[PDB]
C-alpha cells in the first residue's frame, strides 16, 4: 500500500567533508 | 589452502577473529591460523 505522507520537504543537499573516513580492511589477511 | 615446508612454533600475535592468514612486512606467509583453534607462526626456512 502506497501510504505516503504530505510533509516531505527537500533539503539544500548540504555539502560537508568526509575528511579521513572510508578506510577499511581490503582483505582478510593479517599484516604487521 | 596452503602447502609448503616449515618449522612451526607458537606465536605472539594479536590475530583478528575474521582472519585466516598472516603475511609479513614483505609479502611472505610467516604465520597461520590452525583450523582447530590455534594460531602458530610459520618459519618456513627450516634451514638453508
Amino acid at each position: 500500500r502506497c501510504t505516503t505522507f504530505d510533509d516531505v520537504q527537500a533539503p539544500n543537499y548540504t555539502q560537508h567533508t568526509s575528511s579521513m573516513r572510508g578506510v577499511y580492511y581490503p582483505d582478510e589477511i593479517f599484516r604487521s | 589452502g596452503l602447502t609448503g615446508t616449515g618449522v612451526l612454533t607458537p606465536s605472539s600475535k594479536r590475530f583478528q577473529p575474521f582472519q585466516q592468514f598472516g603475511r609479513d612486512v614483505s609479502d611472505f606467509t610467516d604465520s597461520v591460523r590452525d583450523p582447530k583453534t590455534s594460531e602458530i607462526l610459520d618459519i618456513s626456512p627450516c634451514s638453508f
Side-chain angles (χ1 to χ4, degrees), chain A residues 12-26:
Chain A
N12 290 319
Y13 291 163
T14 304
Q15 299 293 320
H16 298 285
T17 304
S18 65
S19 66
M20 289 177 70
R21 294 185 184 274
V23 179
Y24 59 89
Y25 287 151

Side-chain angles (χ1 to χ4, degrees), chain B residues 16-32:
Chain B
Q16 298 294 321
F18 65 97
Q19 213 168 21
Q20 69 272 15
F21 286 157
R23 290 200 293 266
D24 63 353
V25 298
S26 66
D27 80 22
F28 284 104
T29 301
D30 204 9
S31 61
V32 287

Side-chain angles (χ1 to χ4, degrees), chain A:
Chain A
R1 186 182 69 189
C2 295
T3 303
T4 305
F5 291 154
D6 290 331
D7 193 2
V8 183
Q9 296 294 321
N12 290 319
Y13 291 163
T14 304
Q15 299 293 320
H16 298 285
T17 304
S18 65
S19 66
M20 289 177 70
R21 294 185 184 274
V23 179
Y24 59 89
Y25 287 151
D27 52 354
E28 293 181 356
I29 296 169
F30 178 79
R31 297 177 182 90
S32 176

